Amino acid sequence: SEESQAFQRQLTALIGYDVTDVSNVHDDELEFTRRGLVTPRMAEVASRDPKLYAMHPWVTSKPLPEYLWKKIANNCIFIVIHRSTTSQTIKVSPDDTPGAILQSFFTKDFVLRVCGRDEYLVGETPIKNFQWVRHCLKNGEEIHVVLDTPPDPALDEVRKEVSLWDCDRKFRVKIRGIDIPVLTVFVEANIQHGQQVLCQRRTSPKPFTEEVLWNVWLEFSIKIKDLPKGALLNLQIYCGVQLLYYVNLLLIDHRFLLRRGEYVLHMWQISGSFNADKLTSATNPDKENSMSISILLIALPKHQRAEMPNQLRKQLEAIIATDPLNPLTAEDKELLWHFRYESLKHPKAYPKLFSSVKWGQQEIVAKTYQLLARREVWDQSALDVGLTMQLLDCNFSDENVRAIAVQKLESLEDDDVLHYLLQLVQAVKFEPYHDSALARFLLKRGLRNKRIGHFLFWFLRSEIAQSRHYQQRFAVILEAYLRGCGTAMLHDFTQQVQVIEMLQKVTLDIKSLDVSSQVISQLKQKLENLQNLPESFRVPYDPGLKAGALAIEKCKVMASKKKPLWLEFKCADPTALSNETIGIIFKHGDDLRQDMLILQILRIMESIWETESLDLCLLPYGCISTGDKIGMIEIVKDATTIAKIQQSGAFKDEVLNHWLKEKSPTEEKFQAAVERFVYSCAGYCVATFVLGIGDRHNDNIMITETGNLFHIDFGHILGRVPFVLTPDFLFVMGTSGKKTSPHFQKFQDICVKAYLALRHHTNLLIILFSMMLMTGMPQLTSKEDIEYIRDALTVGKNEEDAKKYFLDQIEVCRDKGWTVQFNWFLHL
Amino acid sequence: SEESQAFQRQLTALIGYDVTDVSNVHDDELEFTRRGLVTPRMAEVASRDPKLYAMHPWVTSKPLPEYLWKKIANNCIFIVIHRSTTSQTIKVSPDDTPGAILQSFFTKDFVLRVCGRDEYLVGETPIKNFQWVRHCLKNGEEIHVVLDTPPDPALDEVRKEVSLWDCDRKFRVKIRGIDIPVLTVFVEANIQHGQQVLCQRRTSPKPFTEEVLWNVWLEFSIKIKDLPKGALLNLQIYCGVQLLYYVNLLLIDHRFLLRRGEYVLHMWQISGSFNADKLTSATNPDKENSMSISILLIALPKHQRAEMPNQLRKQLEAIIATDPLNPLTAEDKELLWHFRYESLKHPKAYPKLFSSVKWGQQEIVAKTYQLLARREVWDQSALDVGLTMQLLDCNFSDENVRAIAVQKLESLEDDDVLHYLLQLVQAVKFEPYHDSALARFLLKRGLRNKRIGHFLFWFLRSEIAQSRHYQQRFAVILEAYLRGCGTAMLHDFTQQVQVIEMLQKVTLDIKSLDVSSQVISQLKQKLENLQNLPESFRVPYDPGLKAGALAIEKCKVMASKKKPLWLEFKCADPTALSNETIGIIFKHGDDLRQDMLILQILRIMESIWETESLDLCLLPYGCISTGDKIGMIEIVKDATTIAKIQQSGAFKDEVLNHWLKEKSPTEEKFQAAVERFVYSCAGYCVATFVLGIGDRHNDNIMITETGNLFHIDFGHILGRVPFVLTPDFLFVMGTSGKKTSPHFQKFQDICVKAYLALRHHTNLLIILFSMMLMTGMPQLTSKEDIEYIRDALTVGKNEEDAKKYFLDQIEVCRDKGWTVQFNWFLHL
Ligand SMILES: COc1ncc(-c2ccc3nccc(-c4ccnnc4)c3c2)cc1NS(=O)(=O)c1ccc(F)cc1F
């Protein structure tokens, strides 16, 4: 067709990559996946509710936090409904539905929409179970909604559309040669399966030149029939010993066919590390410069007790109780496997049990499938996200194992998927094949809910624009989502990408030119030209918010070396309750993906703290990676850095407390800010400690006028003191040197409650941390790196040792005063 | 009948107890056993060869020892056949049969009989495989046989002849009271099974008087259906804590009936010890004085894999490799039981595996029987006597387990049964029931071979006359044997018992009267009266030898406090090659049973040494226990004590070497005596060390004129230096203080070869030692007692540490010289 052309081109433009381009594939897997994904797409689209999809209510089934209760006077919540010019304040009960609310208003068709936002309070859900309502309560804000007409669902219209088990020969592969357009070397051939090296063979070392031939058959010890679905041929080049290049080939393809024939693979260049890029089946796109290797190489079929000696059960339980990062000895595996049927009665033994499987033996793999067939304890088990995540990491290449993980994820409510979306999108990198159950799950949940969909779009598009290793795979999944999300979101994404693309250019043109008066007249000039750009666009980190017109006079070039744009937008929603502008930092030169991850962990940390009636007042500002080393960041209102305050490398102790009094008009407020400070401070001390990012210079720590403390720029320290608890912070709590005070004792108490809380989720955090390092920090992918968090969470320790451990830390910060901040200033 | 009367009375007179007397039984088990034993008796009698039974060839299938080879010149052995007055020396080949020999003699009906002995060289056996022939060779004696006529087999004529598994109630027993014709006390009720206490209940303590009543029901935790065949109700009385009396009752009888009703049991008096008397089901016969207990109390039915984790197989093998006296932890048992089918592939795991059985659970016991049903590795296994003995000790009460032990014993040749007869007879004490497979086995093997039979008679009769705990059981078995052994042996036993009974009296009458001239005229007088006594009788420790007339002039009263008779007899066989008299010590006042055991171990030690081409020249003189604290001992010819030599408490170093020169007429002989001394010395050092009986006073060590050293009186030290290696012994080897010599180096070498040899039979010796202490040393029955031999045999050590261990010992003896012998003299 012709309209399909100017539509596939639109898709490409949103995606940022051409899913038709076949200049870099050695098979048809990507294409097959495009087709395969049609069914799940159409299934979800066809069975989605029109009205609920249009309005996308943001709700939760969780209980209302205790601290959120202590803010409700006599089971009454006031809801101010605005019609056109007027407004009526109403008594509502937390337990009643919006439907009810409306009928109790007509006494003194339509649907309640949050004022100045694309957020609807609608559906058969208690007003208390709406996130927006919980947000207002938390901040002590007033709940304002307008009486508008339901969005026309027609705007969400979707456009019209020999057996392997018989070959007993040893596997072998011929290494022809290696070529590079521009020391001795050898090629190493590994047959891997989920980080496990099944078998390995090397070549003879040969003088390294622009072309090295071998023409040798490498015969492995593994029989062709013992090859597992998902096994990689891992080709690596060493020089003399150090790894220079690598590349991977799936030995069994997406149709269960053994791999056969001639291959010239373009390899990746290197910069025992656990980097997820090392696993990719994709070949390097840069054919011109890249090193390449030449190799020369039946379908896989499908599958269809004495009481334990007490001491063995003790040993088994001991093992199952260890942490995810706890290494299994061959003795442990032999035991887990020998007693596999007992192990299966424990959902928590699963990650370790399937790590005890000899995937290199077709008979063992078969018995394993027989295990998963007696899947009743697992299927009936209460969803455990940390446990489910462990089955989705780099240590599992089997699609049935990984599939029972995704199966458990289906019970997640939209609110929880949002909590784990980013890390789930990242976990797609550990999938052997492009079309996996995990991928389909992401796709289905994005199509079912606009909010998840919106972030799915930016998480994918973020990876596609800066990950050559995985962009092809991600681009296909993004396409499947764009073809089912609907006409209105398409138009919205189109608008958002256009705006960002325009703001990118300006950022680049301003950069190539400290902050002079000329560079300022050029920022203002370029902005004036652009504004003369969509009349409105959604904010990617806060999609309910629509930004509109620029406030050029408030725009500027910040004073860092990266010359970030500080932008200010008017809210395009007239029904907005304020004139406060939307503040967006636009930054080029950094890979903001790592920040997104840290911030997202912080959000997960807060929910853990909520399940324990705790609110450490963190501030995970919005941060979205939009392209190659560019992105945008939420400007937190009324905020100033701790360094700028002191600046008013000398440091004063009272200066901070002074600054709060100044900004608090009354005493009730100063005291409430001094509380906020104590909570937000403890929140960031505990958080940063766990994530090993506490030792920051105070230039990187900020504070709101209402006393809310919060760290910033988490990529900088990922690119001694356990955390920043400096005198000025302590002074606010009212303490000097060897002393104590009503707040300091409070602060000490919140920490230990925060700390011990997190430790109740050791495994979930260990897995999330491990995965964060393998998919976002190609630099921080060492064994000793990952195992930092085990120490920081005092694994194995009881709550007394742990408590006394953290307190010792808090002391280290005091005994060291300004010593570390002072060094941090010294410019050597 | 009437002839049966004067024949049952004869049996009683041989037995030394009336198997008809029912004045001491609470059931009919003994009687039932008398009847039960008829079949095995008649089976063996009916199927025994007349001629071979009459002549009882003493043969062996073992190879001729290497040292026995080096005594055969050019495959020729000379055999001097005597007819009447003449004699012909003949060339014979070691490999040819006696049948052959005869045909090679008529050239230059009948049967060859050793001169002056009831010993025949007959049958289809190589002349080399006759023990007599091996004896002559060993001693360098000349083989003299006479051509006599075959013994008439007619002389061997034999005279003409609710279910338990349904009762689910807890077992209980009522303790009425305790009575004694002549502090507080209580009764303790144990349900035991093979030294294992299944369940235990006590009474309330009550003031100890001549009659104490309780009238209380003791309810145990064990269900009636879980009671194992062979379980004992073990009633014990404690005073305040110390055990005073005990008695046992089989809870399930010989017909598989549960025990029911009223019992008054007469209990045994005491003198955590492992005494075999404590296990007896017999009641005390001394009704007049003995303490007794009153108690008040359905038939037992009959019965009809993932590879091991390497580490578990390692652990299992580790366990199975330990020694018999090595204690199993509950962890070990749980493992052996969990992996019972693997354990069954190892005959050596058997003792430990059946010690890992919960006999107190009818379901476990049942599975165990299912194990023994897959008895193929065991049944095909090469006979291991030590292993078979472990299944017959105090730790096994189950008749099926114990029965597979006796089954393995059937493959023993007569020569080997003789080696183990004594300890097998003792092991009958560990049998729960009177009619056991072990008992039948003994009976069958005694009836099949006259020599075994002869010793069977004296071993039984020894126990019957000094063991009230087991005499009833033993007396029944003896009766079964006497009714099938034949008319000639009956007459012989009759003769032997008469002689001994006469010699006993004289010993008693002489005792009640140092050595005066009057007591001498009274010994001679009493002997003169007796001789005016069978004209001939067999020597119980050497049955082939027939003693006849006394040599009164050589008779005397030895100079010990026990006033033993030193007797001298003429050999009643005219065809004897000498005029040397038979020398027999007749001793009253000692329990000679312990000696018999030690000596018998020494004999077992020599056979072990033979299987390793070694001959340490021990001298296990004959010693038979004939009655209550009486017995007889072989006088070793041309022998004098080491003390009497020195006496010629001062000690001289050369005196011993001097004594040898004196007695050796030539130099060739002195040198051959100095060799004999070095071997016999090392033999006794190693032996005594292992049995913890080395530290003897030299009054208890003797030497033959041909240099053969040998210890005596082994009951004395069972009633510091590791062994007697005194200067005088070392001088003979040619050494003084810090020195060495051709012999000393030799002696050191033989020891280590002797020692390491025995260690190859650690288990066999440990079991034999353990059993020797539990059936013969009521005094030496402690845990630390039994486990002495583990240390002396350096269990677990390799042959280097062991070798260097023994050498250190040999040194201890030198560094201490006469120090210990000197103290041994000091009369404090
Ligand atoms: C990705 O790294 C970042 N992470 C976070 C932020 C960030 C986020 C939210 C905010 N809300 C309010 C105010 C500010 C603000 C304004 C002016 N001065 N300071 C902070 C603010 C900054 C910026 C960056 N990048 S950055 O702007 O170059 C930069 C880097 C390091 C540094 F210490 C300072 C920086 F300004």
Ligand SMILES: COc1ncc(-c2ccc3nccc(-c4ccnnc4)c3c2)cc1NS(=O)(=O)c1ccc(F)cc1F
């Ligand atoms: C059961 O205890 C024994 N074990 C063994 C023998 C025994 C055995 C064989 C023999 N062959 C030849 C010569 C003698 C012999 C003659 C004279 N003097 N000494 C030994 C000899 C002794 C005796 C006893 N009992 S004993 O005769 O009372 C006795 C006890 C301790 C003691 F040192 C001395 C004793 F003479």
